[PDB]
PDB file of N, CA and C in Angstrom:
ATOM      1  N   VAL A   1     101.003  95.239 100.231  1.00 18.71           N
ATOM      2  CA  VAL A   1     102.223  95.719 100.587  1.00 18.71           C
ATOM      3  C   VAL A   1     102.816  96.398  99.388  1.00 18.71           C
ATOM      4  N   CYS A   2     102.823  96.256  98.184  1.00 16.73           N
ATOM      5  CA  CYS A   2     103.198  96.834  96.975  1.00 16.73           C
ATOM      6  C   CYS A   2     102.472  98.128  96.980  1.00 16.73           C
ATOM      7  N   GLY A   3     101.376  98.064  97.386  1.00 17.44           N
ATOM      8  CA  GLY A   3     100.201  99.084  97.060  1.00 17.44           C
ATOM      9  C   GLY A   3      99.833  99.377  95.619  1.00 17.44           C
ATOM     10  N   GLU A   4     100.147  98.350  94.975  1.00 19.47           N
ATOM     11  CA  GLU A   4      99.686  98.328  93.450  1.00 19.47           C
ATOM     12  C   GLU A   4      98.565  97.489  93.185  1.00 19.47           C
ATOM     13  N   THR A   5      97.803  97.752  92.108  1.00 18.48           N
ATOM     14  CA  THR A   5      96.764  96.826  91.540  1.00 18.48           C
ATOM     15  C   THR A   5      97.065  96.316  90.245  1.00 18.48           C
ATOM     16  N   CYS A   6      96.797  95.011  90.142  1.00 20.40           N
ATOM     17  CA  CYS A   6      97.068  94.238  88.873  1.00 20.40           C
ATOM     18  C   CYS A   6      95.793  93.889  88.074  1.00 20.40           C
ATOM     19  N   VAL A   7      94.726  94.939  88.287  1.00 20.15           N
ATOM     20  CA  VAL A   7      93.683  94.620  87.430  1.00 20.15           C
ATOM     21  C   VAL A   7      93.683  94.465  85.985  1.00 20.15           C
ATOM     22  N   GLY A   8      94.743  94.698  85.557  1.00 19.32           N
ATOM     23  CA  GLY A   8      95.114  94.265  84.204  1.00 19.32           C
ATOM     24  C   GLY A   8      95.906  93.413  84.081  1.00 19.32           C
ATOM     25  N   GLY A   9      95.944  92.387  85.092  1.00 16.67           N
ATOM     26  CA  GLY A   9      96.972  91.395  85.050  1.00 16.67           C
ATOM     27  C   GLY A   9      98.372  91.632  84.866  1.00 16.67           C
ATOM     28  N   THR A  10      98.652  92.847  85.610  1.00 17.78           N
ATOM     29  CA  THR A  10     100.082  93.176  85.297  1.00 17.78           C
ATOM     30  C   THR A  10     100.524  93.900  86.513  1.00 17.78           C
ATOM     31  N   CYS A  11     101.743  93.632  87.077  1.00 16.47           N
ATOM     32  CA  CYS A  11     102.380  94.396  88.225  1.00 16.47           C
ATOM     33  C   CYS A  11     103.675  95.018  87.610  1.00 16.47           C
ATOM     34  N   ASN A  12     103.961  96.227  88.236  1.00 19.91           N
ATOM     35  CA  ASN A  12     105.172  96.818  87.795  1.00 19.91           C
ATOM     36  C   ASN A  12     106.187  96.510  88.835  1.00 19.91           C
ATOM     37  N   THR A  13     105.877  96.476  90.252  1.00 20.73           N
ATOM     38  CA  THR A  13     106.567  96.030  91.289  1.00 20.73           C
ATOM     39  C   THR A  13     107.036  94.558  91.074  1.00 20.73           C
ATOM     40  N   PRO A  14     108.403  94.330  90.753  1.00 20.91           N
ATOM     41  CA  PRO A  14     108.995  93.054  90.560  1.00 20.91           C
ATOM     42  C   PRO A  14     108.915  92.058  91.787  1.00 20.91           C
ATOM     43  N   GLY A  15     109.001  92.583  92.804  1.00 21.97           N
ATOM     44  CA  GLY A  15     109.078  91.664  93.989  1.00 21.97           C
ATOM     45  C   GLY A  15     107.767  91.480  94.365  1.00 21.97           C
ATOM     46  N   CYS A  16     106.741  91.479  93.472  1.00 23.27           N
ATOM     47  CA  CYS A  16     105.166  91.203  93.899  1.00 23.27           C
ATOM     48  C   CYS A  16     104.404  90.450  92.902  1.00 23.27           C
ATOM     49  N   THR A  17     103.856  89.610  93.366  1.00 22.56           N
ATOM     50  CA  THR A  17     102.886  88.569  92.619  1.00 22.56           C
ATOM     51  C   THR A  17     101.587  89.453  92.175  1.00 22.56           C
ATOM     52  N   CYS A  18     100.541  88.453  92.035  1.00 22.72           N
ATOM     53  CA  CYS A  18      99.268  89.241  91.785  1.00 22.72           C
ATOM     54  C   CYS A  18      97.980  88.568  92.085  1.00 22.72           C
ATOM     55  N   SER A  19      97.157  88.750  92.869  1.00 20.66           N
ATOM     56  CA  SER A  19      95.850  88.204  93.008  1.00 20.66           C
ATOM     57  C   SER A  19      94.708  88.475  92.132  1.00 20.66           C
ATOM     58  N   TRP A  20      94.742  89.609  91.928  1.00 20.05           N
ATOM     59  CA  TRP A  20      93.837  90.381  90.560  1.00 20.05           C
ATOM     60  C   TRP A  20      93.858  91.980  90.860  1.00 20.05           C
ATOM     61  N   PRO A  21      93.253  92.625  91.770  1.00 15.01           N
ATOM     62  CA  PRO A  21      93.246  93.807  92.042  1.00 15.01           C
ATOM     63  C   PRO A  21      94.333  94.437  92.864  1.00 15.01           C
ATOM     64  N   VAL A  22      95.274  93.681  93.195  1.00 16.54           N
ATOM     65  CA  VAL A  22      96.195  94.083  94.157  1.00 16.54           C
ATOM     66  C   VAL A  22      97.505  92.976  93.832  1.00 16.54           C
ATOM     67  N   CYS A  23      98.606  93.999  93.839  1.00 15.45           N
ATOM     68  CA  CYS A  23      99.936  93.127  93.609  1.00 15.45           C
ATOM     69  C   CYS A  23     100.568  92.688  94.871  1.00 15.45           C
ATOM     70  N   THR A  24     100.348  91.460  95.404  1.00 16.18           N
ATOM     71  CA  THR A  24     100.919  90.860  96.430  1.00 16.18           C
ATOM     72  C   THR A  24     102.469  90.839  96.682  1.00 16.18           C
TER      73      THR A  24
END
């Protein structure tokens, strides 16, 4: 939904958690 990846264990989108390669 955030269209972001957290492959580095990090998400820029605040209202988004992280599975691994995608910020939920």
